[PDB]
Ligand binder design. Sequence first.
Ligand code: ADP
Ligand code: ADP
Ligand code: BEF
Ligand code: BEF
Ligand code: BEF
Ligand code: BEF
Ligand code: MG
Ligand code: MG
Ligand code: MG
Ligand code: MG
Lengths: 350, 149, 496, 518, 432
Amino acid sequence: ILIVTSNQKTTISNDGATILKLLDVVHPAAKTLVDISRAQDAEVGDGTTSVTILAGELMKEAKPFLEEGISSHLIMKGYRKAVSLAVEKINELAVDITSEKSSGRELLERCARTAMSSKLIHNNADFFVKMCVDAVLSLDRNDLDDKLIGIKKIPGGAMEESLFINGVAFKKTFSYAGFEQQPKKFNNPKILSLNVELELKAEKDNAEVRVEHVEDYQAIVDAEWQLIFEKLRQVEETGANIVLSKLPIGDLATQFFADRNIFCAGRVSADDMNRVIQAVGGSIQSTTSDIKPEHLGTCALFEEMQIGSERYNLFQGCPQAKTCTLLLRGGAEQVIAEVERSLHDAIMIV
Amino acid sequence: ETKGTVLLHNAQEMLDFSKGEEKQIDAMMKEIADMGVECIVAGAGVGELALHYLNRYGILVLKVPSKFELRRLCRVCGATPLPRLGAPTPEELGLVETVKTMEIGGDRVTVFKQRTSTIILRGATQNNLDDIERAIDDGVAAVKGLMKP
Amino acid sequence: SLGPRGLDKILISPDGEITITNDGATILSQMELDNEIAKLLVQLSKSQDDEIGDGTTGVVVLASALLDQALELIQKGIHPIKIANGFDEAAKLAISKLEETCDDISASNDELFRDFLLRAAKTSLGSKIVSKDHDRFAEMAVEAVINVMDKDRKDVDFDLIKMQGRVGGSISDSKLINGVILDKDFSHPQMPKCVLPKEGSDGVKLAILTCPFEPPKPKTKHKLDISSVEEYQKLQTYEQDKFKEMIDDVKKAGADVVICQWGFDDEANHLLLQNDLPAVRWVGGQELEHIAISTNGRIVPRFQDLSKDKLGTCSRIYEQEFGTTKDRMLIIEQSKETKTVTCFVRGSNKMIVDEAERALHDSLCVVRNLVKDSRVVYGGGAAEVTMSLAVSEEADKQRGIDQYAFRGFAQALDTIPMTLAENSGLDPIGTLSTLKSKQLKEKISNIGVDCLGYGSNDMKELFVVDPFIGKKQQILLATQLCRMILKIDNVIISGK
Amino acid sequence: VQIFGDQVTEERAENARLSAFVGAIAVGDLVKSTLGPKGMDKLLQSASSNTCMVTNDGATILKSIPLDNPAAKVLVNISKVQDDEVGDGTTSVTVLSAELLREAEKLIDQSKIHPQTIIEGYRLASAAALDALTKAAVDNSHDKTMFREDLIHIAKTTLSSKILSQDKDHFAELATNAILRLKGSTNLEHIQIIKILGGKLSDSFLDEGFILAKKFGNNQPKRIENAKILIANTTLDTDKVKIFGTKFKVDSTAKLAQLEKAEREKMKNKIAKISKFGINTFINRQLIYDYPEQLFTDLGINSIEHADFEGVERLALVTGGEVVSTFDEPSKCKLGECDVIEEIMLGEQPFLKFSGCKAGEACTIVLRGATDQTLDEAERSLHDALSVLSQTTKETRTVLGGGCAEMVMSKAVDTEAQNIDGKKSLAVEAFARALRQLPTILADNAGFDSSELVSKLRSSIYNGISTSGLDLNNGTIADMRQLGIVESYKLKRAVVSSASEAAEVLLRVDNIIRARPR
Amino acid sequence: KTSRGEIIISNDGHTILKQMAILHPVARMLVEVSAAQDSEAGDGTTSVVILTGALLGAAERLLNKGIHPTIIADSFQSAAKRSVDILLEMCHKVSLSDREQLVRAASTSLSSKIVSQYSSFLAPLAVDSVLKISDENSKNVDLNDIRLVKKVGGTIDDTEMIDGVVLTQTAIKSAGGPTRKEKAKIGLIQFQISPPKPDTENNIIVNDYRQMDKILKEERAYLLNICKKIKKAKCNVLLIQKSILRDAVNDLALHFLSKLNIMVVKDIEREEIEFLSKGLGCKPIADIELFTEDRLDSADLVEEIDSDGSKIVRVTGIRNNNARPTVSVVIRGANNMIIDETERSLHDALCVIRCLVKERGLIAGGGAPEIEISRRLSKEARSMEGVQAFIWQEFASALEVIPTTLAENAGLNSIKVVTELRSKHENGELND
Ligand SMILES: Nc1ncnc2c1ncn2[C@@H]1O[C@H](COP(=O)(O)OP(=O)(O)O)[C@@H](O)[C@H]1O
Ligand SMILES: Nc1ncnc2c1ncn2[C@@H]1O[C@H](COP(=O)(O)OP(=O)(O)O)[C@@H](O)[C@H]1O
Ligand code: BEF
Ligand code: BEF
Ligand code: BEF
Ligand code: BEF
Ligand SMILES: [Mg+2]
Ligand SMILES: [Mg+2]
Ligand SMILES: [Mg+2]
Ligand SMILES: [Mg+2]
């Protein structure tokens, strides 16, 4: 279905919750069919379409009794048990697959393979099944969440040219003076995951300076350039070679990394930093003047591969990670939407 | 409460103000980590420097609570909240059986199980669940009507 | 607007700004569209331009004929999804033949690799109004990517290559400069135009800075509190000294030219003149980074940190009379190969200038794609025809429902060579039936249209050469956008 | 099935060709009367401001008038380009630009030939038109005697078509002398063009030295004789302060009196540091405070405030001084010196006129006349003159004007068509025919049978008399070297190049798509 | 009546054209010519326009007769060259200091304008002025040095040449009553007499109670010292420039100045300094530590009058060497408009004497030149023959328009006057 919303937001979809949500339902009783869909995406991911389908066709097969002088009370006294009996049928009918000739991973495979069929990526299921099923595995903490396998979107390229990353990724390059002059490719790095802004206090706590004697002047300024020498050389004396931070890295901070052959990035996505540490094995520190080498991270290869004429930071190949990152292509910028919603529909079945 | 201006006179003050601010709050948290605490529930705000140190000290942190929660949480674990940060008393602490991130409906939710209790009425239509909360409350109060008289 | 016989569309912004282009992506990106499918095609071409750079034009043509070839099969009574499926398995057989048949530039020597990259540059250029100097314009796009791309990493950065445009003369006078052009003059009018390297150095040395030639102030809000008059005299005689402590800091470092991020003070400027330090007031952040990489230099935070090793090496620095009456510019050129390379494009008209820049980028993109994928196919329809034939012979082998879809995919492909021979001025059926037939009678798969008009159709000896990835992406994106439209049957549009 | 949004216009092939031609032609035809000696002037007027201007400079027309036809605006810009890169040949570019496009429509319709084939034919011709141009070019060597007389000519040629035709000779030496004077610099800021209303046009002059639109420091001596000048950029009224934030916190009023007197001292000292320079003339870009103004007068130093980055630079070129700041070490900085700075009166306003100067490398031309529009034009006209010349200091080869230059091309192009053959051949001939359509208008505006005279000049030139140009007062073919109607090679080379580009831009046009206006 | 609202009554032609709302661009060109005549002569702004109107009318008939305008334009300018030559040969020179004729010259220019009632005293005292302001090396004369001040009330009669200086402002009188200082020495101040602050951001912070009463102590003192250093140089008149900057002259300083009998005049524009410096033999004073008896004036009397109820400031009698000479003229008039016109009729006459400083020759008037030229340029063209002869003839015919409109304003048979004027000019020559 192709839906163009009231605000020109053009959307193509197969996702039942996504179709029913983009339709503004006003009728109070028909809004139930939007909730009924919504609960299904919330607990399962697939079925959203089928759930609404069933619901109405129960109401429609109750109308031939409602036309005759029957009480709706007794009709639902009959359905309430019918569903309680339908659940009894499935529980007896469900097959524990660990018992009978199944593969360790062809359980999630042949299961995503069903969720794919119907949606756009049907003719590409092969590719997406042996990737997003795989993506639930790297995700596995004892108990897991999809917040850790965050999807990134990049305009252009075939949807086949999508890329599985065993580390993390940034749909986000930034650029300062040195960022081009810096090395944008490592092998075995130590990833320092920082928090606080490396510069001359760009949004920090304001404090007024009163100075009576002139010579205090070059002193107060030479205190500043020394206050961040400590904060910066604090990074060099860590054993790090890749510096990421939730807050900004300045023009004058990037300089020291550029010459000292260290890679740095500022204004990192908040979700991405928590995506990095889980797949780099590091720890987000809010202060440089404390850091032990027990906080750093590693990977197989860090490079800034340019995909779709936007610069992506790809540090990947991390042995033991409780996180990964999908990186998705697709023809138009509306395809990339209906593959992301299509893939969330497979992952949650897996 | 009154505007906090920070008047730096000599250059010796800059290095020692910031590096001392490191310690100032690291010492605020240590006076609560050396009391054998494993969970600090915050009604108000939390500082990024302050969470950093509590992050290392191996302690869970739970922000957001408005007035409603601090009181109803207080009755379950059996703590007593203090506004003065300098008196973490062993006699005014709590005790909780399980504090985990049980994900329900896909939501990252914190639990405080095992006094004040809580029912999690699950369903489909967020519309009908709302009514059966009024059905539950009809009885919950009908129980309060039994006791008093 | 397809091919070297292509024509140019002339689009006007709502404000009034005029553009005259051949870049299919640009064309569609300018027209104020509305019909949701047209809108989508706008993104379809906009997709190509990013993942490749060339092809934007033919990507649409292929999608539309495919949608047309579907249409005829729908009115026949066939289900769209089974057609869309029938197209994709027929797209996977087209790319497969292309891969098995594409020529390769990996098995080449160094003398023959730099030629195949020119041959592609030639190809991509001959189409747009640049064709005039497509010997010179091509010998640019090649020069740029060799100089900037990390060989083993096989990765070219288009942030490194800067597109500079200035209007005057002709397109012939468009040059590639082994350094940087700046819209900046010299900070003091008395300073010289040329700067000559002190003979024994073989370089000029640059004072690339990121602090202003101004008495240092702190970042945190401040104030003095002067009570004693003499202590205002201690301050007064600090202001001039903290200026001389800048000049000497540079003069003692051994630099001959100062390029500084922020601006110089009025007192500092004259003292920059007296001691023979040609200065550059207010230089761009990105532009400093491009200077420091070209000059082999380093970027310097404060005066205290300046040393004779953080200097920028140049072979010349000159302020050019960019116009005859307009404004001066600064060129910092090199005889050696520098990782940054500014591309200075000139024309007789602001519209040519923009199109000329828009041609290089396209031309520069085919050469970037060949560094990534060192394999080529031959255009002029040849690549499309080999795929058309390949899918055509396999349709009879497919059988059942998809027999008609494969026959459709192949048939709609034939619109590219037909609408090539059409614009070029030949019979559609003629060139097609000659070309497709000649590609079976011989084992050769590299026979195409003589769109210029020479005797042979031999795309090999004619140097009409396309990159591999280019051709491939131009199909996958079409078939995949095509499937999406076919999946759609229920359409709900709101109100504006 | 409609594609576009509303208010959107689609002018495709058959209609896009119309627009492209209608536009170009409509614009070409607008300025056609400007061309040549017996050419006429347009009166442009804004809706805005109740302003107008009476002009020849063909750019100045095109730049001004509003237009919608995108193809037109293309040519309009090719006009500015020329005014940028050469300064003259504004109308020569546009007409040749349109005349190519006129000649295309006559091919695209009447004959039915492909636009791209026309292009691949207009191209072969252009490279051949520019070819012979260099072969026929007359480069002037070391003989600066033979080259000045050569320059004076170029101007005389440029000037005849403006109001300055009648006093051609007069204005020709005022340009030639000013540009030579400029000493090979190609920046025109160095010639300050001061137009003061009143008197004759023949009353206009280039001063020997410099005239300054400034005043003397107050009750100061009205005429300095035997000057020595310091040129400065340093603060004065603003009161020099160390930039940061030097707030005064006086414990009790007492100290403020000392601190007020302190700022006065900081001045008395910075004037003393200047007094050490041993100079009677202090000129400053910045303002001289009410205070320093007196401190100079008491010392006897003449002080001139407010002549900006503009005025200061020229003074530095004419007096041979330096744009000095600092003033801490008088030894290393080079002073300026001239003979007399007496204040003159011109109609009403007082100007300080530096006379007898160290180095004449910067100059002032005072333009006069009866009407604010006459001035306007004189300025515009002079800029067209101070251009060709200046750029002929750079590009020092000449070509015979009077239609001759364009004809020698029409020759080579037309003979190149006798070589090429095919459908291209017709387009190559056309190029030459367009080139002919230039002398055509030169004659047309003068008034004799265009058809006869251009056809009288073709023969002579084709026959090998490649001097022959158009005697545009007598209505005859006469010698252009012996009559001295010379032009810049850099001029003509550009006219051909630029035009050949336009056609190859519009001829590729087959679809004009206009958005909904903002 | 102004677009803005103001009422203007005039005879000065440039003043007439500038203030009507001419719309046609070519018609606006006429205003420019009339402006350019004012900026070359100050007189003849009417003559110059009418000539264009009869020259254009000429050009019209020639275009009717089919003559290419380029020829017309150039031969009309060839008509200029020969005509201005004639005026240069026919003119009788003037002794650069000859009152009896220079005075007739102003008397001519006035007699046309609403001030011609009092042209008897207005002509000489406009001539008297320019020669005093002139020079020996003559040159080009600046009329910015002639000071014409307005004040409404009375009659044009009451206009007077002041034997010194007129000033715009008045004695402050806020504190004390100094107004008419006799045997006076004038000081001229650039600086502020306040409790001033340095150009940097400054603020007196107060810690103690005992700091307060001592702050006013120095405050009162600081202002008194300045007023003391003034009385010490020995001047009884103060003149202070524009205080838009910051301070001005304080109300506390003003009582010091009053009881110390120094008469004060505040707010004086920066343009006014150059003139006042020369007009009052008084060197301008920037800082206090540069206020000296040396730079004071020594004028005989300064006394502020009371005219219509509205005061003006007089400086009569000025002792010292007048190396720079300066005049000041007070204009009165019954109605606002008839004051502005008095100034424009002075400036027109003042300007004719200025032109006599420029080209030291003088011609006969009342059309006489315009008729001679007509006669001369006729005989020239009878020799010309061909096309460029008809032009000159039509040109000679045009110049005749001046005497025609002159006569037509007088209600005469302009035809009869002219034919007779040309016949008598054919013999009796350059005076008819
Ligand atoms: N010199 C040539 N001879 C024959 N065919 C050519 C030549 N140059 C380009 N082509 C063909 O014509 C097409 C050029 O289209 P173009 O206008 O460059 O748009 P795009 O390449 O972006 O689709 C290519 O597909 C190519 O195969
Ligand atoms: N006195 C002259 N005699 C003959 N030809 C002239 C004369 N003056 C200029 N020309 C010719 O007329 C043209 C100049 O006309 P103009 O209106 O200035 O156009 P543009 O602004 O394009 O230079 C040149 O082609 C030149 O050859
Ligand atoms: F239509 Be669904 F969310 F599989
Ligand atoms: F017209 Be294209 F994108 F080479
Ligand atoms: F009309 Be021009 F620019 F000589
Ligand atoms: F009417 Be005028 F300018 F004497
Ligand atoms: Mg499903
Ligand atoms: Mg191409
Ligand atoms: Mg010209
Ligand atoms: Mg008069």
